[PDB]
Structure formats: C-alpha cells, structure tokens
Amino acid sequence: LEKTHNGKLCDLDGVKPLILRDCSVAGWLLGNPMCDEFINVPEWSYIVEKASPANDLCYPGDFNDYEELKHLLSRINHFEKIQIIPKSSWSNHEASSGVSSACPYLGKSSFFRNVVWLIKKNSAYPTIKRSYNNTNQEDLLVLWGIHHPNDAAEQTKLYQNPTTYISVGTSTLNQRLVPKIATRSKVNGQSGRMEFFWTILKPNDAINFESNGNFIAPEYAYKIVKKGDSAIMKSELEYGNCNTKCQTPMGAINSSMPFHNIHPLTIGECPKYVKSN
Amino acid sequence: LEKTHNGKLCDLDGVKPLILRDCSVAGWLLGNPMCDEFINVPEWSYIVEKASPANDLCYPGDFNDYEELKHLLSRINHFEKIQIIPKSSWSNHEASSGVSSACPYLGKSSFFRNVVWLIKKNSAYPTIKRSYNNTNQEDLLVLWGIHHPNDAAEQTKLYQNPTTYISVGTSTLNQRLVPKIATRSKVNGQSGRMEFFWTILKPNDAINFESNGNFIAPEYAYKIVKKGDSAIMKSELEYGNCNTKCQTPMGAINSSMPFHNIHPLTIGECPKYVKSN
Amino acid sequence: LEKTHNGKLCDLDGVKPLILRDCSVAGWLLGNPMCDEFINVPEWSYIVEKASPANDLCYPGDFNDYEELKHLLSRINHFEKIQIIPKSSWSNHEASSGVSSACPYLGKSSFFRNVVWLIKKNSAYPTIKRSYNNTNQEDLLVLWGIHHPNDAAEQTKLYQNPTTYISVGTSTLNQRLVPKIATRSKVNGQSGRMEFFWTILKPNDAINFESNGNFIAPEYAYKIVKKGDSAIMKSELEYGNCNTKCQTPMGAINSSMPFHNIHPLTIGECPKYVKSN
Amino acid sequence: MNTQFEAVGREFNNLERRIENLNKKMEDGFLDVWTYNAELLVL
Amino acid sequence: MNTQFEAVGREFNNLERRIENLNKKMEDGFLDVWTYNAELLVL
Amino acid sequence: MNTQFEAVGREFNNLERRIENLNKKMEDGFLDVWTYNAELLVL
Ligand SMILES: *[C@@H]1O[C@H](CO)[C@@H](O[C@@H]2O[C@H](CO)[C@@H](O)[C@H](O)[C@H]2NC(C)=O)[C@H](O)[C@H]1NC(C)=O
Ligand SMILES: *[C@@H]1O[C@H](CO)[C@@H](O[C@@H]2O[C@H](CO)[C@@H](O)[C@H](O)[C@H]2NC(C)=O)[C@H](O)[C@H]1NC(C)=O
Ligand SMILES: *[C@@H]1O[C@H](CO)[C@@H](O[C@@H]2O[C@H](CO)[C@@H](O)[C@H](O)[C@H]2NC(C)=O)[C@H](O)[C@H]1NC(C)=O
C-alpha cells in the first residue's frame, strides 16, 4: 500500500506530457491568442488541464459537443496542424478585421487564430462556397463557427443580409446552422456569441461550406497523425522535469507495491487503487 | 436484517417532507390551478411524488429538460417564490384571458399561475422586451413557455403576426424558440400544445426576453434559498404524522440492525440494503 | 466451466430466430429492396444482425433515434405489417417515380418499399393532409422521412415550393421538420440525403401528417402483436438448423455446468459467464 | 461494511430508455454484489 | 450464485462515445468482479 | 488481482448532470467493492 508520491508531473517513459498551463482544450484547438505556446505541439504521452483554465473561450460562446471531442482526444497522441483555407483567398469578404477586445493579444484586439471571422465588403456579402478534399493519409479534425449577433441592426451592419445560414456537408455530416439573435448580458465586454462546431474528415472525403453570413471559416485544421493510449488529466501542478512509469493528478509514483492510496485516476503501469488507510 | 417498517411517511429529524398529493413536480412549479396547496411551501427534508400524479400538465405539452430539473431539485430544500414580471405591467398585450378549460379552477377556465399566456390587443402584438436583473444573494429558477397553435388561422387570431419567435438571453443562455404549428389529437380537449423551459439565473446576472408572439411569460420565479441533501421519492403513501431517522417508499424504519430488506431507495441514517430473505 | 459450443445459431425452444443475413434493422424496417426476404416475417425468439450489414440505408442518410428503436425492438417478438396510406390514394402528387439508382432492385432504380417518395405533379405540390386513426388493439410502429436536396434548383424541380416543411402530430408527438439543403460528397452516387423518423402510435390515437414538399410518406406501418423477452445479437454466423436452450454469438451451448467461457452476451437459460481459463 | 453501495433514484424520459436500462442494471448489479458479499460473510 | 450479473448488448451512435465507454467499463467491471468472486470461492 | 477496476476520467456538461452522477456512483461503486475485496483478502 504505497502512500508516497513525488508531488509533480513527469514524463511517461521519456515522452513529455502536454501541459496546457492556463489554456483549456478549447482555447488550444481554436487558437486563443493567449495560447500561442501551443501553436505547434510535439507528440504527447498525456494531457494536463487545470480545473478552471483562465484562457478558454475569449469571445463568449459555446463549443458544441465539447466533451465528446475531449473524449476523442484521449486516444490521440499527436496532431499536425495544416492550412485548409488560406486567409489570403477571401476575395469578396473582408477577412482582416474580424477581431475583438474580448480576445486581446498584447493588449490589441485579436481573435482565435485557427478560424477566420469573415465580414462584409463593399456593402455586400456574396454567397461563400468552399471545399477541402482531405488528400492526406490521415483523419482531419476540422473546426468552424457561427456568430450570433445581438440584434437586427448588428446583423445587417456586419453581414448585409438580414437572413443567413451556414451549411456544412461531408459524406456523413448534413448541417445547416442559423444565427440566433438574442439580447444577452455582456461576458468579456461582449453580448454577441460565437458557437463552434467540429467534424472528423475521413481520408478522401471532402467538406463543403456554404454561407451568406455569420460564418466563422476555418483556416487551419488538424491531422491526427499518431493514435494511441492517452488521457486528459485534471491537475493544478506545473511540470516537474522528472520521469516516471505511473502518474497521478497529485504527483508521480515510484513504487514496487501491489496497491496504492493517492488518486483513483492514474495513467501508465500502476499499482491498483484502494480507499484503505 | 430488519424486515419491519411502519407503512407510512414521517418527518426526517423533525423536518416535514413536501408531499405533493396528486400534483407532479411540473404542476407544482408551473402552478397548475389544482395545486394551490403548494403556492408557498415551507422548507422540506425530502419530496414525495406519486407514480402517475393526476395534476401535471393541465394544458397538454412538454416540460423541457424535466428530468435534469428534478435532479436539480434533489439538492434543494427550500424555494422562496418571487415576482419578477408583474401581470399588471403588460400595457400592450392582453394578459387576462390567456386561460383554458383544460386548466379548470373551480370549474372555470384558468391557467398555470406562475406564467402568463399573453394574447394580442387591438389587433396588434408589439415586440416584447423585458429584463430581470437577479439582485438577490441567491440563484433563481426562472420558467417560461411557448404556445404551439394548431394552425395558421389560430396563430393569426391569437397573435396577429404569422411568423414569430421567442429569444431568451442570460450570460450563458442563448435561446431562440419558434412555434411549431401541427395537427394533433386532442388531449384534455386541446390540440394546441405548451412547451416549457427553465434556467438558473446566477446572482447579478440578467435574463432578457424578447418576442412577437406565442410567448408564455414568467410572473413568478423561485429563489433557491436553502441548498442541501434532499431527494424525490416515488410513493403512494399519505402523510403519517410520525417522525423518523430513516425513510423508505414502503414506510419508515425504527431499527438498530446493520442491514435491511424493505426498499433499495432510502433516505437518512439507514441500515444497508440487501436482497436476502 | 463449459468451454465448448456448437459454432452455429439454433432455435430457442423450437422458435426460430430472425436472421437478417446482409440486411440491417434499418434496411428491414424501411424496406430496402435488397431485403424482400423479410417483407413479412414470422414470430422470432431473438434477432441476428452482422457487424456491418451491407444493405442498410440504400439512399444515403440517417435513421433518427435509431439505437432507441433497436432497444425497443429487443422486447418485441412479432410485427404484423399493415397498410396505413395506400400508394394508390395520392391524387395530386406523383407517387410512382420517387426512385433512385442508389436503391437498385434487379439493377433497376427502386426505393425503400415501406415509405413513398412523393414528387410534384403538373408543376404543383399542393399541401398534403393525411390522418391515420389506430383502430387496432395493438401499438403501431409508424415510419416516415424527409428528403434533404443538394440545392435550391433541385428543391424547386422536385417540389416546386422553395420553402417547405413536414409537420407530424399525435397526442404526444409535435414535430415540424425542415429540409436541409447542403453540398455533400456522393454516397452511393447520391449527394442528397434522406432522414427517417419513427413513432409508436398507441391504440385509439391518430397521427396527422401535413407537408408542402420533401415528404417521404408512409405506406406500411407495423402492428406490434407479440411483446416479450427478445434481443439483437451481433454475429457473423449463418443459420444452423439445430435447436438449443442457450445461444451465444459464437455458437449454441448444450451443457449442465454452472459456469461458461464463451461470450458474455447470451440469451436463454444459461450458465453464468466468467473470464476464467 | 459502512461504505457499501447506496442506490439513488434517477429519472429518464421515453427516449432515454437505453440509459434508464443501463442505470437499472447497474443499481441492481451492485445490490446483487453486496447481497452476495453479506450472505457469504455470514457463511 | 443464481443471481449474478448478466450482460446485455446495448448500442450507441458516433456521438455517444462517452456513454458507450461508460457502459463498456461497467459490463466489464461486473464481469471482472464475478470472475474474481467465482475463482476465489473455489480457492 | 491484476484485473481489478481501473477508473477513467469522463466529462459531462451542465445539462448532463444525471449521467455525471450515474458515472460517479459507478466509479465509486467499484472502488468501494475492490477496497472491500482487498481489505478482506488480507483478513
Ligand atoms: C477527393 O479527391 C479524390 C482524389 O482526387 C477523389 O477520388 C479519386 O478520383 C476518382 C473519383 O472521381 C477515382 O477514380 C479515384 O480512384 C480516386 N482516387 C483515390 C486515391 O481515391 C474523390 O472523388 C474526392 N472525394 C470527394 C468526396 O469529392
Ligand atoms: C445587474 O445589476 C447589477 C447591480 O446594479 C450590475 O452590476 C453593478 O453595476 C456596475 C456594472 O455596470 C458595477 O460597477 C458594480 O460593481 C455592480 N455591482 C454589483 C453589486 O455587482 C450588473 O451590471 C447587472 N448585470 C447585468 C448582467 O446586466
Ligand atoms: C380515433 O377513432 C376512435 C374510434 O372512432 C375515436 O374514439 C371514439 O369516438 C368517440 C370520440 O369522439 C367516443 O365517444 C368513443 O368512445 C370512442 N371509441 C373508442 C372505442 O375509443 C377517437 O376519437 C379517434 N382518436 C383520435 C385521436 O382522433
């Protein structure tokens, strides 16, 4: 009955975990400007996320089917970021001032860096049609979003068209989002909302986007390059520079015993957990 | 192995349970006219609800996310009812004849007393905008609803506007309901439906309602004043005037034994349950 | 500890199981043309379905709340198919060319045989109103669907009306579907989708359909005539002509032992399962 | 034996029948275990 | 031992992966328990 | 005892509170069982 741990987070067989610091999984994947540390991440053994990470959704809103994505994250060990729609290519929509003070970078209005907040151009917002064929060997995690304005005037100012939609189709996904104008209390100075969506695009499939307003377009998606045993661990601890074969949220374990006492949610070759004293 | 119980429902340490009689949780909270017994309720230890309470949703319909609300009810011990939008304040909408024979009171057409069924006035239904800032120390349970008519003619008669919406915003809620005109079999003489929604409004947050038809506005919400261990017990028994330290749906237990036989779903300091004979 | 099985699927007390071969539950119930073997099925003990049945949804799409229907299927032993809206009765909508090469029969374009894919007639698609009163002693399983086209032009070609709906009402169901035009990759040569819905119609209730386009109308529903213990078993095995009192996905068991080793998911009077060797 | 499984009542709607069943077979599952564990502690 | 855990097959879709996993680890959980309980009744 | 219940972390949102509770009482449920099973193997 081992009762002792080293009170810090180590590598798991010389493979360093991804420690998110004050960023959440949502902030990392969407590209919260406070999360540049994680723009391109090396292979991980497990992932560590604090209870209430401070930098999550900078612009207030929602990440749709978020817990299922997280669950889908704990059997992935390595993403490789790739550009699927270059910000450069938006010829008929303003693509450079979709920013907000709710998403500061160095005290300047910025925005999640993996998606683009398109806005009208010359008092017009033509219908957008874009495709990406996944010509890679690997599955892709694609993310996009919708902006829910706070009134008819705002809608018409940003997007011209009073009534708008976003349709997204793959070989399995048949989605058609409609923005929800409501009156909301300000979170981070904003009463508008952003709602985000994701899908896994299988090799050789294609994703087709079409919209006439409120579209938060992708720029970067994620190649799932290494699948394998992984986890998301909720911990407050910082990185400990050590190494181990058994990790817990409380700290690592170097032991020979058959049982342990620390924390039920462990990862690696570990003694079995009991409540005993 | 205690096999004996007193076959009735007692207090739990001198705290009387809330026995709903023939009302359901839905009928109580929404204010079914058959449920006036429970307009203002003193602190409870646990709640008792029959299998099929006769007075539930008088006007036929649906209580959205009902089981999650019930679950949220079994760690509450005391609501204190407060008025958040006075029925008196509706200047431009008829607020006094939103009633139905499906909701009788003393054989007269009435309606759930905690929400108001607004109707048009002088052939018009202006856009409704209302806010309530929760200026209390405590969380609020706010309830509202939508009326799904049974045809275009009914829609236009009651609400003038053929196409309508209800938007509700807090700091977390971003809802936009649209009435669903269908043709339905009569339940309680009615083929229209009412669908109800709820949210917890945190201290200092504000709820904002906006609609141009089909709105079932709140009047009274609930201050969650006492949080603590509680439960909803499904039982047919009436109140027994006694007292106890262990209650079951079958009856109370006065015992010293380590185990018991009666019913797996008990509340209080109790012997452990086994299937043994 | 019985370790031996007969490696094939038998009857369960002289009651033959329903072996779906290469059809799925979805293909059987909707009436995939490749599934005529199962047009009218005798009483079953249990149901057998392969891991990836080849004939499932011929026209690409979705069966809504499918797993709940399957769960609802494992306490049914006998359906009796009945006609609730005769294909003959569609006077103002074309009812005979709603077919597709994605649903071949003998290499000819066909379609699921239990529902009808209505199309416009003389450049018009009047509003459809139909009712069926369940005048049977038994519950009915009613199935219907919606067609999601791949663009505005297709919508207008097939259905005339650019903006359409399907509303379905019972005494409990209040549904209003809207087709979702998206751009999708071709599955089985098709980029349109069909989405299917179901409901149980209680004795004496009535179902009311109303639509002005994209409606996949029912023709045949199912009388739930025999309720009782049943299951859906995932197996690759063909029918074995034998009989048994205990069946597993791996094969049947003739044994006297108290325990067994084969497969955890068994049906009938069986020895208890253990992982032991 | 102070820390033995205590069942809680949980409620599920008409289209939550799978998780209702999952819940039932779990609460029964643990009851059946501790019944066995107490009967065989005695014996 | 007549009242021992019996596993039922349950099905979950592509976005029900958490409760599929919850279900799997429960059915395994009880199987692992009764396996242990029968192996140690013998011994 | 190599095959004993191992708990996994699972996450649920604000309106998934019933299955969060179901999950918690299951993981605890199995922990409480194996705690008892190891304490009484010793004794
Ligand atoms: C995505 O692109 C691939 C590759 O260009 C397409 O599939 C190829 O092209 C044709 C189909 O028209 C076939 O003859 C080849 O066999 C395919 N090649 C490979 C490597 O699969 C595919 O059609 C596109 N996918 C979508 C969904 O549009
Ligand atoms: C609800 O009302 C409260 C109280 O009037 C508002 O918060 C106060 O007012 C300003 C914000 O503009 C602050 O300077 C004070 O510190 C706040 N007081 C307290 C006690 O919090 C609040 O803005 C309103 N909430 C919403 C969501 O509109
Ligand atoms: C379905 O049809 C039944 C049978 O015609 C209807 O119920 C009967 O008719 C009237 C109701 O108007 C009653 O007086 C009878 O007692 C009923 N008979 C039976 C056997 O129940 C019923 O109204 C129809 N249901 C719906 C939902 O429209």
Structure report:
The complex is a heterohexamer, with three copies of chain A (277 residues) and three copies of chain D (43 residues). Chain A has 277 residues and is mainly beta. Chain A has two domains: 1-15 and 238-277, Hemagglutinin, Chain A, domain 2 (Ribbon), CATH 2.10.77.10; 16-237, Alpha-Beta Complex (Hemagglutinin (Ha1 Chain), Chain: A, domain 1), CATH 3.90.209. Chain A has helices spanning 25-30, 66-73, 152-159; strands at residues 9-12, 18-19, 47-49, 61-63, 76-83, 100-105, 108-110, 115-117, 128-133, 140-148, 166-169, 174-177, 193-201, 206-211, 215-218, 220-227, 232-234, 239-244, 246-247, 259-260, 267-268, 272-273. In chain A, strands 4, 5, 8, 10, 13, 15 and 16 form a seven-stranded mixed β-sheet that branches. In chain A, strand 2, helix 1 and strand 3 form a beta-alpha-beta unit. Chain A starts with 8 loop residues before the first strand and ends with a strand. By secondary structure, chain D is mainly α. Chain D has a domain at 16-43: Single alpha-helices involved in coiled-coils or other helix-helix interfaces, CATH 1.20.5.1450. Chain D has one helix and no strands. Chain D has one helix at residues 17-42. Classes of the chains: A mainly beta (277), D mainly alpha (43). Chains in contact: A-B, A-C, A-E, A-F, B-C, B-D, B-F, C-D, C-E, D-E, D-F, E-F. The interface between C and D is small, with 5 and 4 residues. The structure holds a molecule of 2 linked components (NAG-NAG) (3 copies). A molecule of 2 linked components (NAG-NAG) is lined by residues 133, 204-206 of chain C. Chains A, B, C: Glycans are attached at residues 133, 254. Chains A, B, C: This is Hemagglutinin HA1 chain. Chains A, B, C: Disulfide bonds join 10-242, 23-35, 58-103, 246-270. The PDB classes it as viral protein.
